């Protein structure tokens, strides 16, 4: 019922205040200096110790006993090089950049949560870890924080992402496979005269075939050939799946290889070209999802819980929920007539009145988890 606190003029105004400053000054991946300085100042003001730097601009705060169990809450920090088309007082003052992906609401609701949780810190049966992650858009920030030990000793992490595809004030998630993974591959087709070209256009159609839709949105698999360019032809492609990703990677390789061989050609295929490691699908741990549904129902209502549909989007949170139990949820903003623009657009819009919902959900989820682990 801490939503009442989260909605307080003092707290809500403070949250809306910080959200706007970040919104007016969008910073790109790994260059979120000002966003990072603000987060650190608010943690300082609230009364929360933190580790900095992590992944250049990242910050990790602590609330509780200081001892295990450790549970983490995560928010992204970076904007995108998009010109804000929304005309308003708090529009980005940085031309060509915009927080058109809600992250502003994310850092915001994470500082909210930090502020609130601190209010009840001596009651926490463990330590809530607050992760302020840089460069989510380029899908390399979560992995970099992991490399730097951000996940050590931590046993369960929760993340929230505002959504224009979910009704306002409803949190949406599902158990297990939720967000699609993504990988790339590179192939070089060289003649062991025109065969290489014959082989290349063949392989292309043959890989484009693999893409398909079925009756379960979790079975969707796609392979996109984007690069192709005669002694040798380089073919750069991508692949995505919610399940059986490894089996799809091998299929892409097998096809290119055999389709090259029957055309008397050499086949060079790389599934991690230039250090582009695959990003596995985002999997929501059943226990966290099961616990999460309760937190949402107890807080908002028996009807707020929105069972999410598998999505083929991009969210590097998966590098966390694969290494430790993870739970990723959406937070609704959409109104009755769909006036709220979809994420990734010059017109994107968070309804600023959603901040207390995620702040409470963030705060609450960390408490119930700990107050459950100790049961």
Swiss-Prot record:
Family matches, as CDD domains: M20_IAA_Hyd
Domain of life assignment: Eukaryota
The keyword Manganese is assigned to this record: yes
Binding note for cofactor: The Mn(2+) ion enhances activity.
Major site of localization recorded for this protein: endoplasmic reticulum
Tissue specificity field: Expressed in leaves, stems, siliques, seeds and flowers. Detected in the distal tips of cotyledons and seedling leaves, hydathodes of leaves from mature plants, pollen, ovules and developing seeds.
Protein name: IAA-amino acid hydrolase ILR1-like 2
High-level lineage: Eukaryota, Viridiplantae, Streptophyta, Embryophyta, Tracheophyta
